Design a protein around this nucleic acid. Structure first.
Ligand SMILES: [Mg+2]
Ligand SMILES: [Mg+2]
Ligand SMILES: [Mg+2]
Ligand SMILES: [Mg+2]
Ligand SMILES: [Mg+2]
Ligand SMILES: [Mg+2]
Ligand SMILES: [Mg+2]
Ligand SMILES: [Mg+2]
Ligand SMILES: [Mg+2]
Ligand SMILES: [Mg+2]
Ligand SMILES: [Mg+2]
Ligand SMILES: [Mg+2]
Ligand SMILES: [Mg+2]
Ligand SMILES: [Mg+2]
Ligand SMILES: [Zn+2]
Lengths: 151, 51, 56
RNA sequence: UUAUGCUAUCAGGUGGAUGGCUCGGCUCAAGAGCUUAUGAAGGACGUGCCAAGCUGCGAUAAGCCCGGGGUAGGUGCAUGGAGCCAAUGAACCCGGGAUUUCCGAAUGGGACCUCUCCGUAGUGAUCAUUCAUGAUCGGGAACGCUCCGAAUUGAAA
RNA sequence: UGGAGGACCGUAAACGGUAUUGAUCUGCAAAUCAUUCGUGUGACCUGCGUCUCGUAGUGAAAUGCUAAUCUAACCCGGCA
RNA sequence: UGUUCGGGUCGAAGCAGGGCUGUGAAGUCCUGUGGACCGUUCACAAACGAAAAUCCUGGUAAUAGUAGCAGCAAAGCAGGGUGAGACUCCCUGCCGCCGAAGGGGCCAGGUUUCCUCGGCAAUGUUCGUCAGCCGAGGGUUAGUCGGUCCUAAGACGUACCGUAAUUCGAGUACGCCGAAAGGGAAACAGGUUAAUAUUCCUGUACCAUUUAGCGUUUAGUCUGACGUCUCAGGGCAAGCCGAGCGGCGUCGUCGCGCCGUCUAAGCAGCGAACCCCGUGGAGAGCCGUAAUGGCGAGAAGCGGGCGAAUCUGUAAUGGCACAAGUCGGCUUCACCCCGGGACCCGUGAAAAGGACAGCUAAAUGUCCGUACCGAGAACUGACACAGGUGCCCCUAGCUGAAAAGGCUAAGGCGUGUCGGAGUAAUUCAGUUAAGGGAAUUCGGCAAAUUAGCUCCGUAACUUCGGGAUAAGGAGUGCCUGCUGUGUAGACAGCAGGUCGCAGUGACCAGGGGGCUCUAACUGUCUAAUACCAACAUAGGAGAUUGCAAACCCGUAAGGGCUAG
RNA sequence: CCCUAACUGGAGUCCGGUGAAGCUUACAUUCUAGUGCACAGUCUAGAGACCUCUAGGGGGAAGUGAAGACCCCGUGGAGC
RNA sequence: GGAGAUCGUGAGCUGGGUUUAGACCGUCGUGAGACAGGUCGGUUACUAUCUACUAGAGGUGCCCGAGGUCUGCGGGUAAGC
RNA sequence: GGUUUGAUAGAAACGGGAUGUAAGCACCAAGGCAACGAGGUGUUCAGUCCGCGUUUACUAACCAUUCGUUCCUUUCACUU
């Protein structure tokens, strides 16, 4: 065996893997020592005297199970929050989703026909003003104050 | 990467060619009276002012 | 930075190029004149009597 | 065999003084004294069979042609190998011609680009005439003529 | 709901340079290192280009800075 | 030097050591070395006599086999080779370092340091068979990548004029230069070498100028072409999840974990917002947005037109262990397209080029750069320098608000180039400490305490904005089952059980309060002993001047303020 | 801090390799008193002392670095 | 209790004051500047050659060769107040 | 200090100690249609460890060199 650094570099270029990811077989040092061209290195790789050691990734099973538990609603107590509220849920997004839901519900109630123009305008501006906190809340007020034209 | 014109590269080529050991037959003919010239340098030392 | 070795790292530009008429590295790239032979300033060559002792 | 040391002499190492030699320097005297647009001095790059520097030379590139002198060797500083040239008179010296890259007074335009653009192949700027043509520009060791023009110092301030 | 401000906190991003009167003080360094600190959407930091200079320039002004030189820079000459 | 008399290869000068003479400066002789020149009488000359100048140049001691080869990144061990020689060079296994920089891309700068072979006197803080070192040879291929082209601040040239005069001086006219990060006609995938590759080769393309043929302008407009902050919508590289298929690992028990499951430009097709047009007839009000808002000067609604990224097909046969090569879903910045709003005693470039009249064919597309580094070893600081230039532009999984800190991938390294041994004092930097708790000291200097998030609660004073995270209290882990908002990603809340001395369990992470002086505040400052009460500032006041002005530069020609 | 103690990593101590610089008229194993330009290892009179080496902190060598920055002088300068 | 030892002791430490360069207040000066008045800020260099001392070793001297056990010329003490 | 004529150091077993009841297995567990399930109880004063002692030659204290002659000379009372 001799200085085999040159063949190391050549095999890394041919294979495309990093230098330490090349595995030079230690029983074939005499035969690898005679490999000086790209064609010879390809022949050696085909014969099996060279190869690339597999990359060891980062496993993700543990985090995967933890994520399943969190998605169920656990492992998220007060002792795990470390960022200010608002950094976990910006207020503008909350308002946007709320108001879009309310407007789509009112629009569909107008579209099907169970809500005339006057009450529609009043309820639109009222929801703009912030008197309903959710779609079920709006449905409760609509079914209480009778402003829908259900029959 | 120091994009050069033709003349700068020409002068760089000359300054490269000047780094040569004096020929052995010169040392034989002059009887060990010529063993060096004042044009020898090294790349990681005093910068040349060729450019 | 400091006035010594700390501000000598910004020493990457050049102020004098190489002169065509005399071959000396003395051509000011801002004023466009050779500070050794006077190229660019004039068609004559720069010489001053204070470049030598009074010859007596 | 008293160690570590002290003094003196001898042999050797290191070092480069002294002496001898010297194609170099310096001073005085006698001569001689301009050159360049027919492209100078100076510079860059190239040029040798083995060639890095200096010297010479210019893509005909340590060189080519002619006339005279000189006579048997030649191939620079720089006696190495292998070759070539030479009685068709070489090498060398004196006189006269040829080739003479790019920059440079640099002059078709342009230069932190010694190269580049259009090629309309190129009279740049200022001048004189008969408007054919002609003149000036840069360099030169000191000497020469015209014009502008200090202070240190002395007076013991 | 909205998203203003020579606003706030904060990175060993960037810029600065308080205290240790620490380490080093023939040093890694002819001014650096470690911890602790100040600003961090603006009178902000910065690359490249260009301009302003010696009885002159530039200076939110200390006689600061103008190539390790500044209560008048540097090279040569007057000059032995 | 002039002159008289001589010596020397049978051994001159010079050098080392001795004998004799002279008070002495010094002379002469002897021995060893040396291998070619040297004296003397009478006179005359001078670049004529050294122990000292923190003297100058060269050589060389002691200090001394001493300091340094530690501090910010404590890194190596086993087995096998090569070789005269192995802690240090090579291969495999284990153990480690950085992992939003020590990785990748490249400017300026460097200039052959790049690759192969042969060496180890010097260089490398040790050795060395190694090397950015030494010797020989080799290596950079462009119509599409840049320069080249346009102009910005601003330079330079010729002329005119000034100056005793110029190589000097402001302006005017005409030119010409100035950006490898501004504007900009056009190319992608794969292969090949030891070192070059959108450059060479295979395939598939595209763009200009000229010539020939076949036709024609609208020629005046648009684009190039523009600030700071903030926000909606769409798309996508990266990322993640599920099913099938092919490999690798583990296997004391289980059946999980990782890698792959690919595909460019070009060409053809479609089009979201804004905008334009034809209808329409809305008010004791209707239509909308995340938000501002719109409307008889014509809303809602209904039709049509111009109009994006990206997407679909082809290119589809290239590469892959010709091994598989099939599908779905979520999210999406820091990248692309499109639109709205706010702000200004700030208004946020110009020109070349391109579009509107082109289509077909052949020919032409010159010149220069292209290797490698781009930094704790290729630059700069005299160095293989802990500084600076470059943190200039980019970066995967988990925890987490996060590009913080910690732990790991890919990639790069064990060279922030001395080792062995393990035993004193002392020293640099850390961990802990009974009882007391500033008694230390000029002075709580130094170190410790506190620290995330949610909820409750919050004083004097006040320019009514603040003070304010005031102060002061309580909760936080894991498991089982759920509820609410939302299109979703996700976010918020609950009930029961349970462990420990301790649940932001490590990393990260304010000690607080009171009374005075001083400067209003944010900002600037003696680069290398002074970051302050000093300078600046908004606010207040005063003075000059009606423009051929006040103030100022120049010897003049002419200029700054002043496109006022 | 009373009042310090134990422990950890890097140096130091010991061994191998590499390998500098700065003080130096000469000698030098000292201590006490006197004398002396009045602040002596070297003079005068006593007292002590066998030589070499290693480690250690700095009492002395008016220790080293450096033609005093404080004061005066010069018919010396510069700025204001 | 008071004094001495270079008002002992910075190649041991500290840097509070005084004694540089910056700035403020008062008083002087027409002014540059000054105070013997006050206040805020402001770099502490060195690898030990000789000697002295504290400890640890190797020699040589005296001596039959070696080993052991003692004496005690001397030195020290505050060993207790 | 010891060195076979031996308990000097180490291994093995035991005594004396430190911590706090190991892994797997079984039963129960708030629950869940199920899968799963933090955790508790038993095996279990358990497991893990000891820079301390006792017994015991089980391995290593083996094998040697050197001074107590100036060195050669027959300058010797030696010895071929
Ligand atoms: Mg300076
Ligand atoms: Mg003269
Ligand atoms: Mg005078
Ligand atoms: Mg901050
Ligand atoms: Mg002078
Ligand atoms: Mg002398
Ligand atoms: Mg890490
Ligand atoms: Mg070496
Ligand atoms: Mg141009
Ligand atoms: Mg060491
Ligand atoms: Mg202030
Ligand atoms: Mg002020
Ligand atoms: Mg006088
Ligand atoms: Mg002292
Ligand atoms: Zn010149």
């Amino acid at each position: 065996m001799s200085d085999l650094s040159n063949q190391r570099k050549l095999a890394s270029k041919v294979l495309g893997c990093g230098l330490d990811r090349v595995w030079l077989n230690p029983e074939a040092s005499e035969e690898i020592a005679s490999a000086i061209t790209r064609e010879d290195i390809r022949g050696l790789i085909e014969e099996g005297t060279i190869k690339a050691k597999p990359v060891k990734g980062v496993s993700r099973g543990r985090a995967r199970a933890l994520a399943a538990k969190r998605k169920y609603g656990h492992c998220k107590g007060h002792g795990s929050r470390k960022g200010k509220k608002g950094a976990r849920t910006p207020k503008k997004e909350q308002w946007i989703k709320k108001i879009r839901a309310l407007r789509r519900r009112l629009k569909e109630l107008r579209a099907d026909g169970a809500l005339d123009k006057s009450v529609y305008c009043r309820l639109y501006r009222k929801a703009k003003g912030g008197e309903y906190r959710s779609v079920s809340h709006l449905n409760s007020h609509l079914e209480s104050e009778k402003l829908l034209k259900k029959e | 990467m120091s994009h050069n014109m033709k003349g700068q590269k020409k002068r760089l080529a000359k300054a490269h060619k000047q780094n040569t050991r004096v020929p052995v037959w010169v040392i034989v003919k002059t009887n060990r009276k010529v063993v060096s010239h004042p044009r020898r340098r090294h790349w990681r030392r005093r910068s040349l002012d060729v450019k | 930075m400091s006035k010594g070795t700390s501000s000598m790292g910004k020493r990457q530009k050049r102020t004098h190029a190489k002169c065509r008429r005399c071959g000396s590295v003395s051509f000011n790239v801002h004023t466009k004149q050779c500070t050794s032979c006077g190229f660019g300033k004039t068609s004559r060559m720069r010489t001053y009597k204070w470049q030598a002792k009074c010859k007596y």
